[PDB]
């Protein structure tokens, strides 16, 4: 459940630490972005010599939320914070080469199969 | 095709072997007794009239009791009608049970909603509320404007205002039939149907696809 002005942690090694969602893509008057949704972000904090710098406007995919995901039997999987993975603006491919922390099986698509492969754990 | 009169028992789940839980509404469909058949010669249209359930013999009036005795059935809790298609035939006294829906895949369920009483415009029509702060004066959930000015100088018909909500007839369409159990007179539809627990339901086949 991500919306505009939501601050997210970053779950890859691109160099960012905190990012802010500035638009939930994919429709007009669209409110929230769950796990597996592309968002438009801006970088609020970064490391001194990363691939990205503070103030960039990029895309990202949501991989963990405190609200959690729902499974067909009724189960829920929640986390402690919200995390995303940076993507390129045009090709929409990951920028980092490592993934930190678990991800879930909502990312299991042709679009994000590189995130599923690098992930330490898939729930 | 005709429908059946049931009763909402409640909701539960049905677990699938794939591990998918289906929310179902349990509808108790006892046998419906045909009490009158209407035709084009005498009534101008073709329909059957069914009764279901039971009734205390001290609560049955003499007018109602004579209408059941003429058919040869025992008094039920009410009377409902179903328009017949052409080619469907029934006789007075015939009993129709839940295996009518043995091969129907989707149904329409009609019931009376739950009553919410007098409801405001925020609950009834999804109006926006106004500011909770910033100087507002006794106007936190009021409707706002209801018209223009001198032209037209009146409020239009069908304006959305506060009033009685719920407690009316509602039809939910195209519900999947999960299970038809004839020995315990059950019918399991996927999803939620109008009404409280213990209400009357009219279950037809789906008109659409």
């Amino acid at each position: 459940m991500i919306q505009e002005q939501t601050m997210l942690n970053v779950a890859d090694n691109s160099g960012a630490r905190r990012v802010m969602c500035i638009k939930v893509l994919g429709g007009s008057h669209r409110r929230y972005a769950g796990v597996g949704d592309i968002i438009k972000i801006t970088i609020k904090e970064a490391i001194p010599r990363g691939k990205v710098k503070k103030g960039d406007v990029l895309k990202a995919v949501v991989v963990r939320t405190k609200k959690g995901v729902r499974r067909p039997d009724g189960s829920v999987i929640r986390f402690d914070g919200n995390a995303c993975v940076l993507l390129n603006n045009n090709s929409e491919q990951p920028i980092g080469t490592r993934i930190f922390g678990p991800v879930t099986r909502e990312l299991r698509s042709e679009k994000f199969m590189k995130i599923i492969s690098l992930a330490p754990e898939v729930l | 095709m005709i429908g059946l009169v049931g009763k909402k028992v409640g909701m539960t789940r049905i677990f699938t072997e794939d591990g998918v839980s289906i929310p179902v509404t349990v509808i108790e469909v006892e046998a419906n007794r045909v009490t009158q058949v209407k035709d084009l010669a005498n009534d101008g249209y073709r329909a059957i009239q069914v009764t279901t359930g039971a009734k205390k013999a001290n609560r049955v009036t003499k007018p109602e009791a004579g209408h059941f005795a003429k058919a040869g059935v025992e008094a039920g809790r009410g009377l409902w009608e179903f328009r017949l298609a052409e080619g469907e035939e029934f006789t007075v006294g015939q009993s129709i049970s839940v295996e009518l829906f043995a091969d129907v895949k989707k149904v329409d369920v009609t019931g009376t909603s739950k009553g919410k009483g007098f409801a405001g415009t925020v609950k009834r029509w999804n109006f926006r509320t106004q500011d909770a702060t910033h100087g507002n004066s006794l106007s936190h959930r009021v409707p706002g404007s209801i018209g223009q000015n001198q032209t037209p100088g009146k409020v239009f018909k069908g304006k959305k205002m506060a009033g009685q909500m719920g407690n009316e007839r509602v039809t939910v369409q195209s519900l999947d039939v999960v299970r038809v159990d004839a020995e315990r007179n059950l019918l399991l539809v996927k999803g939620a149907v109008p009404g409280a627990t213990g209400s009357d339901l009219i279950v037809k086949p789906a008109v659409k696809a």
Partner: protein
């Protein structure tokens, strides 16, 4: 409602073990990676239990890869293959929600031992 409680009694599992909040439990769930089917283990502390018959559930919290993960299991789900208790915990409460703000040595749970 004798009708609904009879429809639910025919779906309930018969050998779900006994566990209480504070216990360390390993649950094995069915995962489907395309076309094949396997079991994966979720091990943590039971922080909550819901007793509602067929609608029973229980929450399990664990720290995985540096991130806290809470998972609510539907007890009579056929996705849950088996539940097994690894350790018994001594707590005074029925809901251990105060363990969300604790971690490390502050989130240790005493063993019951009896």
């Amino acid at each position: 409602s004798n009708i609904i409680k009879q429809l639910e009694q025919e779906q309930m599992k018969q050998d779900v073990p006994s566990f209480r909040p504070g216990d360390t439990v390993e649950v094995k769930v069915w995962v489907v990676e395309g076309s094949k089917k396997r079991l994966q283990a979720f091990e943590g502390v039971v922080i909550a239990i819901r007793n509602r018959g067929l609608h029973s559930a229980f929450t399990v919290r664990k720290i995985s890869n540096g991130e806290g993960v809470e998972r609510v299991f539907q007890t009579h789900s056929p996705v849950v293959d088996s539940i097994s208790v690894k350790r018994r915990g001594a707590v005074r409460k029925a809901k251990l929600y105060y363990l969300r703000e604790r971690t490390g040595k502050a989130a240790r749970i005493k063993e019951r031992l009896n």
